[PDB]
Design a protein around this nucleic acid. Structure first.
Length: 51
RNA sequence: ACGGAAACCUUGAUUCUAACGCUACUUCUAAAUAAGCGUUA
């Protein structure tokens, strides 16, 4: 779902391949790895619209 | 110069012996130190 939602808009050479079950841990992985991105779409971006 | 005089309601005695302010009870329950990089060049 994350690849069909976010990672598909970027060049394939910038996206890594999975050897085992994927996960995103810690800082720097992005907002969509830490939210319910299906429901946070729209709300998250408008939270930063005036910055 | 009195039915009056003399005469301790007195001596010895522990309000004492025994007895747990005790029995049971999680300072516990969810929670990434994480998000945003625009515009100009």
């Amino acid at each position: 779902d994350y690849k069909a939602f976010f990672l598909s808009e970027f060049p394939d050479d910038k996206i890594q391949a999975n050897l085992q079950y994927p996960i995103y841990l810690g800082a720097g992985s992005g907002a969509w790895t830490k939210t319910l991105f299906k429901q946070a779409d729209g709300i998250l971006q408008r939270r930063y619209s005036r910055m």
